[PDB]
Paper text:
O-antigen acetylation by AT3 domain-containing acetyltransferases of Salmonella spp. can generate a specific immune response upon infection and can influence bacteriophage interactions. This study integrates in situ and in vitro functional analyses of two of these proteins, OafA and OafB (formerly F2GtrC), which display an “AT3-SGNH fused” domain architecture, where an integral membrane AT3 domain is fused to an extracytoplasmic SGNH domain. Multiple Salmonella serovars have a rhamnose moiety in the O-antigen that can be acetylated at the 2- and 3-hydroxyl groups by F2GtrC proteins. In AT3-SGNH proteins, the AT3 domain passes an acetyl group from an unidentified donor in the cytoplasm to the periplasmic face of the inner membrane. This acetyl group is then transferred to the SGNH domain, which catalyzes specific carbohydrate O-acetylation.
Author numbering: 380 to 640
Amino acid sequence: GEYASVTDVYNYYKYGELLRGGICHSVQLTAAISNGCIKNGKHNIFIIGDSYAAALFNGLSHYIDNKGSDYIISQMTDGNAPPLFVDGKDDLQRSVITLNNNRINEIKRVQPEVVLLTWSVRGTNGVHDKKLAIDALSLTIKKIKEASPDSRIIFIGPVPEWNANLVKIISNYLSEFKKTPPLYMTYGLNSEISEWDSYFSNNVPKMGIEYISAYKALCNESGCLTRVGNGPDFITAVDWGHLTKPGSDFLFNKIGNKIIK
């Protein structure tokens, strides 16, 4: 039905608009500053990382607007550029190390109240060995603390991932069983992400920063959240894992009060 008709997920979900592509996501530094992506006011929440970090913007914006909060949002994100100093290239063939040097320099300039970070743990320029990944994050943490000693640093952990595009997993369930799946499910759910979330829950707080489990916010004993309504416009992920607007909104409804007291 409606789920089977979504065959081009990036066009259907307006994926560029979702991440603020061409404005704050995957842009040159002079464009980022001119477009107002780096705020200098009080109560500034400064997002850094790859497209998983960009996907947080919608839910945080919605939480602030719904609460009538005076908090503001900065964003320096780029596809295939985690907030880790790894010698790889982003989607525009730029140096991931150069991009992270520029992010640290802007954090130093504006002294934000909060730095909010995440990445795609299985992505091209991620770090696959969990212990070496903690060591790489420790280098970023030390640079942020030196640049802006009063900033709170918050790592929002990995979101749930699926074995194909989530809309295709739901279409597959309907074709096999001719029944709508449950709201929370393990059908088509990737088993590795829970292991990353558990490792970070145990080890990140000892590094002198805050950890928020996105996985525990979106998952329960029945599995992980597929949707907040009937049809493709209400599912939680664009592809295997990048949050839709409804997915991002649900996450921040759950975790926003851990960021804004």
